[model samples]
Target: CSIVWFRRDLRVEDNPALAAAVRAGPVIALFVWAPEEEGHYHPGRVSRWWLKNSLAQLDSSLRSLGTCLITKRSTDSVASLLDVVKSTGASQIFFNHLYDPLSLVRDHRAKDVLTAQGIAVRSFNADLLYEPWEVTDELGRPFSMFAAFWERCLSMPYDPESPLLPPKKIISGDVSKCVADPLVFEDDSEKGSNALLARAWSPGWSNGDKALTTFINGPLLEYSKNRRKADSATTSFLSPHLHFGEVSVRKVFHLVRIKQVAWANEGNEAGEESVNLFLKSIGLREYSRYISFNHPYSHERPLLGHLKFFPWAVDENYFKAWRQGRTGYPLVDAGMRELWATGWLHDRIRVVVSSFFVKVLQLPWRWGMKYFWDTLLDADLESDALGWQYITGTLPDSREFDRIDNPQFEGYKFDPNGEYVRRWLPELSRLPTDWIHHPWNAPESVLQAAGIELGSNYPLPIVGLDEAKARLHEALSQMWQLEAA
Candidate 1:
């Protein structure tokens, strides 16, 4: 008997470890729920909601192939695995890789312990287009420059082998001593909050696959042009799905490339261009993992030297204002509420909202990243760390704090019609488009007509831009002084 340990790669198909385990002999599909082992990055409520449902979907899929997933909860994953192996007399254990700092440490420890006991352990890359180490520059160094890494990455060979198909009829090995642990959410209100998500998302593998097919067929053609269409999201909502490894990036790349080829043959120039742009989006996904793999401690603070002394003003009032969508800025307010309710946001909206969090509210970047980590269903450790780093001018492609987007006008351009703000913020729904973004600026009569009161129905700006930049400039001066040392 051999074990196939499931982690983020939740899908049954295109699963390298599962396919390999099945080929070896009878298999046990296993998942260990280890919240503590995750360290500071424990799976948040929204992600746990996705994981619980995803595990259920994976189990049902495995049952269709003549097996079932065996789940257990433990603080130490390796102990749980050893007990399963001992009970089942498993000769080998196979699983895919997880690259985050905590997972990397735990996995390496598992391999050593299991190998010393003479059981073979195997792992495979089931997520990214290429494993992080496989893509490197001419000098064989990990490239830090996003552009160079991306361009170099594009030239690197894509997988010559096709993605693996799900094996037919996996035989379930003896787990006579094992009792499966039920995956449960402890928070009663969590179920209530998670239930609302069904209106916006479906998180399991089959659903994720269906989502990809839907995107490739229609919105993908207009992706580059409309990826920022805040209402329709003209982009694939596969972030959560992809984050869970519900679908393989390799499969996504190949399928999209096939479509791009078809469009090229038909000479659909716009479609071809969109496909390339979509591919770049995929490239960014790969590069983020590339960034995190190389810089594991990035979650702690910016790795950039210049950022060492930057001071972040602490105030829970402002953070709560941003978190609860009580910030007076309408577009940011709407974005925050949408994120809280939906566990997702349009990329453009997210960046603007995050920029507001750091640049305007003057909150620490980590605070927002952690909030997003806890809330976003599609949340990726690499993406959040990289994005927050970039937003705060910690990463090379910095946007200076003073150059922050005016949240009011940010809404006008993206949600120009204010349809977006109205959907997530029904309080502002009655306000005219002219005043939707800056509700405070509307005439008192207009506010009366719209059934609103600033302090009662909405919050006033928690911190004005003038004051925010004042704090930022002061912090910048302090950082520069420290740099002189």
Candidate 2:
């Protein structure tokens, strides 16, 4: 008998470990919801909401294949696994890999103990398209640059190897007799904001498939031109699905590749460009895993050696304002509000808002990263840390921290029509496009005509751009001098 322990991978489709277990013999599917073991990366409120629903969907899917999912709310996953194995008389345990530092340590320990106990432990790759060590530089070492790493990946065989077919008939080994508390799916604390989330998202494998198909059919073609535009539905809404493993990257990669081939035959250059950029996004996701596995302590510190214990301005008030969408920059505020309400944001909005947090407000990037991990429904630990690290001048190819974006200027280009800002920031809804991004710059008569008052209805600018620039200069100079000494 075999016990297939499920983690972030909730789907049955193309799941390598699950497939391996089915071929072996009788399988018992298990999920251990151990929040405490995740260390500093305990899931945020919205992601937990995503987890419960995602698990519920997985349970239903497993039941359809004639084997029900067994869930346990346990502190020790290994102990829980041992209990399940002992009860089911299982000789082997199989699971897919998770790349976070804590998970890596825990899985390694679990494998050793289980193997010592004479229970065969087998693990397979189901999360990343490429396992962390597979791609490397010319020196047979991990590549630090994403471009080099991803180029090598594409240059290699480039096969996620035909997404393994999910078993049609999974033979169930009973787990009702195992020891532990059953997973409690319903927690009413999130009920208030959950209504807003439910309207926008549907968790599980089937719904994820629907979203991918919808994007591939239409939005995919427009993706190349409009992916950076925040005001339109130009991006694939596959972030959360990808994070939760409701769908396989191989499935996504395969579907897009097929379309690219078709578009090539039809001489649709624009369509080909869309797939090019779209696949680039997928490559970034792959690279995030590569980064996390290589640099396990990335969540706590900069990946590069230059910055250590850099002084960061800490003000709870500014963080509150930013979190509440009261930062006074229309584009920034709108992005925060959208994120607050939906546990999601456009990638463009994310870049702008995160820039406001770190570059403009001078908040520590980890605080913003942790806040994102707590709030984002699609909150991936690797991607969340990687983006903040990239923006905060921590990576090898870091964005200059001094090169701050003018939020309103960003608004002019990305939300020129003010549709995205208007949707999220209703306070500026009546303001015209010219004044929408910079409401404070509006004439008094224009403000009255729009029925608005800055510093009353909306917040005034929290920090002037010049002031932020000066502060960043001083901070970096101080850092440089101290490091040199």
Number of backbone collisions per candidate: 0, 1
Pairs with backbone N, CA or C atoms under 3 Å apart (clashes), candidate 2: 44-374
TM-score of 2: 0.97
Candidate 1 runs further than 4 Å off: 158-160, 175-179
Best by lDDT: 2
Q: TM per model?
A: 0.96, 0.97
Worst 10 residues of 1 by lDDT: 174-183
Query: For all the candidates, what are their Cα RMSDs to the real structure?
Result: 1.6, 1.6
Error of 1 at 431 (Å): 1.0
* lDDT (Cα, tens digit) per residue for candidate 1, span 1-485: 88999989999889999999999999988998988777778888888888888887888898899888899878899999999888889999999988777777889999999999989999999988778899898789998777888787668765534778898789989645336887675489788777776676777999999999999998899998886578684888888999889998888988998998899999999999899888888888888788778987777657676767777778888898889999899999999998888888888888999998877877889899999999888878988888888887787767665676788878878899899999999998899999998887789999998988989887778877777778778888998988887
lDDT of 2 at 116: 93
lDDT of 2 at 419: 88
Candidate 2, residue 400: lDDT: 68
Superposition error at 17 for model 1 (Å): 0.8
